[PDB]
Design a protein around this ligand. Structure first.
Ligand SMILES: [K+]
Ligand SMILES: [K+]
Ligand SMILES: [Mg+2]
Ligand SMILES: [Mg+2]
Length: 135
RNA sequence: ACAU
DNA sequence: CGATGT
């Protein structure tokens, strides 16, 4: 029903899918950019959405923040819940970097705890997520 | 179908 | 129009 304004919103941006992937996290209320990942040469939209949520979890935990995270990605929200990114992207030399980051994000989830609620941003009711790249 |  | 996902 109501946006929880005291939250962190994340989104992926890409050039191609698969293609160059980046992501960022913003303060939902103000749009202040809180983190931005350097572009990764080849990845998928869903791998980027997953990495963005996990990075948000790590960012909030490090800062002792209980804020929830918004993502618009049904897929990535489930992958985080499962602690398993079920990506179809081939593993080869050009995808090694993204797969290393995904593997490491899963490993972090399997070795840390968090209470952070991971919430679906209701794009149909609220418009684009505040972290959107607008592309 | 839904979410990107 | 194409692709990534449940
Ligand atoms: K966009
Ligand atoms: K589809
Ligand atoms: Mg998104
Ligand atoms: Mg977006």
């Amino acid at each position: 029903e109501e946006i929880i304004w005291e939250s962190l919103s994340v989104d992926v941006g890409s050039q191609g899918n698969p293609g160059i992937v980046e992501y960022k996290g913003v303060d939902t209320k103000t749009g202040e950019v809180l983190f931005e990942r350097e572009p990764i040469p080849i990845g998928t939209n869903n791998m980027g959405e997953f990495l963005a949520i996990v990075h948000g979890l790590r960012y909030l935990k490090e800062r002792n923040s209980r804020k929830p995270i918004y993502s618009d990605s049904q897929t990535a929200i489930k992958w985080v819940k499962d602690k398993k990114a079920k990506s179809t992207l081939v593993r080869n030399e050009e995808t090694a970097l993204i797969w290393k980051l995904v593997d490491e994000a899963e490993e972090w989830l399997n070795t840390h705890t968090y209470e952070t609620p991971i919430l679906k941003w209701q794009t149909d009711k609220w418009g684009e997520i505040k972290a959107d790249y607008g592309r």
